[PDB]
Ligand binder design. Structure first.
Ligand SMILES: N[C@@H](Cc1ccccc1)C(=O)O
Ligand SMILES: N[C@@H](Cc1ccccc1)C(=O)O
Ligand SMILES: [Mg+2]
Ligand SMILES: [Mg+2]
Lengths: 346, 265, 214, 265
């Protein structure tokens, strides 16, 4: 009826289409025909059942991983945000960063002619426009997106700003950089990943308040206070940032029986130059504590009148334990020196 | 400023391993179209024993050490919010849910039922009185055992493998014939793990369901349909999976333990 | 071969089992037989496909709801905990609360002869034993469980204790009741639910620091 | 103490509506055994057009307003980590992933691909240049259209219904024959919603895949297998679902907006 010639006896036929029909070349094109003429509604409903080829097994992991993370954040207290993957070539300047490696040939507008190499610029920018529309006292958010440098990459950045948290009515607040870090650390605490920060010079980050980020023993992303020069180049006050690369590495848990025998407690302080970083300090103390160091915390420190003008004090709470048996004091005040010795012996 | 310094001591939460394991198992069956639903920890001897072909004075009732209860003014709800009767007890397994669900619904369907169960037993390194199970039920015309077999097989793959495999041996249960116990191949640790029991839903169970339904005014729905159900111990698997050595550890609210599973996901 | 008599021409047969076989009553019992003798391993693998009866549609909601919540908490900063559903009748006193409506007839021990009517008692109790084993400075956790009063009920409780949060080294902390509330409010902020508290007298709660939840 | 007082100002996070919608859609297909996987936003003209039966100088290429890119030292990765060539651009839809996945895997399988796409267009109340789509692909011997039909039907039910239904009309796509557009019945608002397109994977697409595979050393895997794929606009649905009026709203980082979906789940 569609003007085709059908030769053959079956089961496979010779069908020559009318010349005015150019969309008819394959057998499938021919099937689509019977279908539309019979009516797509005359096709029944069904569901397939099969055991999927093995190489398809794990597949979801990556995606899944990204989402659990996405979720934890929101549960931790971050508002998620969605930003255009575009970038104003000009901002490569405005924000002290290298130029975009990818440019559009048909940009939507000269201010979205490149491809974001960084996420945070967009965040900060959002901050601004929010302030101008509605005046939020504080703000804490994040965004996960693809940035483009030599290779496409999945990045995660977060921004904090405002008075901080604390009692609304009551005077004080607690905010600033150490707040952002506070959250950051808790996040990894939740992901079961070891994270720490080490001062690092960043063109876009105020120095002194600059620092690279070390997830479980690795260097990825940074964290810090937004360099004021930029803070002001924009009608903006002080802001705090951090931008990482995903996927986050992962430490497969190795469960470990905790012992019942009570721990060995200790009071201890360290006096070292005002410049020295907490890091190395904890590092050393820790690396010398011995194989029975259960805990290691810092409950206090201050510059301090009663000591060397260029040195500081360190409140370190210590705990020890032995799986199989209780720890004999012989080994405690002993290993304690093992540290103190190489402590400032260095 | 010293950036290496510690930030504001913020609370980092975590989840209980059972919850994690439960979750994991659930996500698995969910991918095969199973839907999760829970039942009551306090049940009626009717749903716990009678509904499932379990006799009063015969050897079967004697496979579950039950906790009997007492007390008044306690209202037990039936599948349709009605009040039901029978000696009260602590669900001895999650199977009762099998019934409540069927009475309340229409085939075909696929459900899975996580839940804490209770058995009167002396608590040791591998035995508890309080633990969790995960029941599974799939009813519909045409269901056969091969389906159960595939079901379990998919589960294996999902847990270990594709270098893992399944073992099905015949075993006896009053609510399924054929009845069977199934083990799973653990490629890593190299051994066979007895996981749980399963089988083709027993005719007298279906009978029971319909009978109670009509007594409730509903039309029969399980005549001419087939089905299989299974149930497995969660703690065991969780222990093998997350590598825990003492089952008592789960109900032992020690933090040093619980935190160990903070980032499990 | 199993000693059954088989009469009939098919397709349905008359099978009388040997008397020593008591487990053989139904047709199904008979099938389990062919199966075990042929071998359970000779059964193929398959997967069913069907559109589920409509009344089964929403079903997962409740469970799902409970879990999202469970998850949010852990993400907010709460450690989850699992406590026995048992209760020491004695604590009905120790903790100012009514007596358990359900008792065991074969308790595991007189200290687990009743059914928890409240969750928190168990939590607090856990707190203690933790302090005695390891000495945690602060603690924030929760637990979701079934309590038993006139009807079985799903309850959620959380406990806070310790110095509180703030700078470890730096002097001050911020904790106490208004901390717990702080978290509570944020949780609802996350669930999109309006919550507030109003002072209420509670036998087990210090007054003045007591309050019902809305 | 005054308990009615406000507690410590703690930060309450939230999630972006697209993420929520995405999530919801994903959980849906996951229950039918679909697995989620993502592709790259920056693609090669080869995967975006050529692989799928899309010609250079013919009317088809002319249905997608593409963003062309430029720049050096940028490394684009192929399905097997190899470096691939072709004019660079911004994925115009998520279909390219269809290919990358097939080249890299073996049937039978079910996947779903969420992802942000880009189209050169003027941004108005119902049209964006940057938005998201969700691609779906199911390949295996025996696959037919009825499967696609059921697939979509299940999706409908999952979203509205069981008082909702599906509409399938024939439409033209270079990578599927038969091709079709499908609408869904919204019982509440009472109207038909055009959701997305779908169809039976085109033979030349399968051809392409195998051809590139062999060029990569792999044996052909898509001869003698069938398949269907579909793709739908996420923003549209999210708007209808969560009741949003302006599509521009999504990329407009306004908080008063974003927070509105705090407790969506
Ligand atoms: N819950 C059952 C396990 C099982 C379930 C279903 C069928 C067969 C066995 C038990 O207590 O052992
Ligand atoms: N992503 C396609 C939608 C589609 C997918 C698969 C088959 C048919 C249509 C589009 O751009 O329109
Ligand atoms: Mg045609
Ligand atoms: Mg038998």
């Amino acid at each position: 009826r569609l003007g085709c010639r059908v030769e053959g006896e079956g089961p496979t036929y010779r069908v020559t289409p009318p010349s005015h029909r150019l969309d008819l070349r394959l057998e499938e094109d021919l099937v689509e025909e019977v279908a539309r003429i019979q009516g797509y509604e005359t096709i029944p409903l069904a569901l397939p059942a099969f055991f999927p080829a093995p190489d398809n097994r794990g597949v979801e992991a990556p995606y899944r991983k990204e989402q659990r993370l996405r979720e934890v954040l929101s549960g931790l207290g971050f508002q998620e945000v969605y930003t255009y993957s575009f970038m104003d070539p000009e901002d490569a300047r405005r924000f002290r960063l290298d130029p975009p490696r990818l440019l559009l040939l048909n940009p939507l507008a000269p201010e979205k002619a490149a491809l974001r190499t960084h996420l945070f610029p967009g965040l900060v920018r959002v901050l601004k426009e929010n302030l101008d529309l509605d005046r939020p006292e504080r703000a804490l958010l994040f965004e996960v997106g693809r940035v483009f440098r030599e290779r496409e990459e999945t990045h995660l950045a977060g921004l904090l700003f405002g008075e901080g948290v604390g009692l609304p009515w009551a005077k004080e607040r607690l905010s600033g950089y150490f707040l952002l870090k506070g959250y950051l650390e808790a996040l990894f605490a939740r992901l079961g990943l070891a994270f720490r920060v080490e001062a690092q010079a960043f063109p876009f980050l105020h120095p002194g308040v600059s620092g690279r980020v070390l997830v479980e023993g690795e260097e990825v992303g940074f964290l810090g206070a937004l360099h004021p020069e930029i803070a002001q180049e924009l009608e903006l006050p002080p802001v705090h940032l951090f931008e990482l690369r995903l996927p986050l590495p992962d430490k497969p848990l190795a469960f470990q029986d905790p012992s019942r025998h009570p721990a060995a407690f200790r009071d201890l302080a360290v006096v070292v130059p005002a410049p020295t970083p907490y890091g190395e300090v904890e590092a050393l103390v820790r690396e010398a504590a011995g194989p029975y160091l259960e805990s290691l915390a810092l409950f206090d420190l201050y510059q301090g009148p009663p000591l060397p003008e260029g040195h500081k004090s360190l409140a370190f709470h210590l705990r020890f334990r032995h799986p199989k048996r209780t720890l004999r004091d012989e080994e405690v005040e002993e290993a304690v020196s093992r540290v103190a010795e190489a402590l400032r012996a260095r | 400023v010293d950036v290496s310094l510690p930030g504001a001591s913020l609370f980092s939460g975590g989840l209980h391993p059972i919850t994690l394991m439960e979750r994991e198992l659930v996500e698995i069956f969910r991918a095969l179209g199973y839907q999760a639903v829970e039942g009551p920890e306090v049940e009626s001897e009717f749903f716990n024993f009678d509904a499932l072909n379990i006799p009063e004075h015969h050897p079967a009732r004697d496979m579950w050490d039950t906790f009997w209860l007492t007390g008044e003014g306690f209202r037990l709800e039936g599948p349709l919010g009605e009040e039901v009767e029978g000696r009260l007890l602590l669900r001895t397994h999650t199977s009762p849910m099998q019934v409540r669900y069927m009475v309340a619904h229409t085939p075909p369907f696929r459900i899975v039922v996580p839940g804490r169960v209770f058995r009167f037993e002396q608590t040791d390194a591998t035995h508890e009185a309080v633990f969790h199970q995960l029941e599974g039920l799939v009813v519909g015309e045409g269901i056969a055992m091969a389906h159960l077999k595939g079901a379990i097989y998919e589960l294996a793959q999902a847990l270990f493998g594709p270098d893992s495999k399944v073992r099905f041996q015949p075993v006896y249960f009053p609510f399924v014939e054929p009845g069977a116990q199934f083990a799973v191949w653990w490629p890593e640790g190299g051994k066979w793990l007895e996981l749980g029991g399963a089988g083709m839903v027993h005719p007298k169970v279906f009978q029971a369901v319909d009978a109670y339904r009509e007594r409730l005014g509903l039309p029969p729905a399980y005549r001419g349909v087939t089905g299989f159900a299974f149930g497995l111990g969660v703690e065991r698997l969780a222990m093998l999976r997350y590598g825990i050595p003492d089952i008592r550890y789960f109900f032992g609210g020690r933090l040093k333990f619980l935190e160990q599973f903070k980032g499990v996901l």
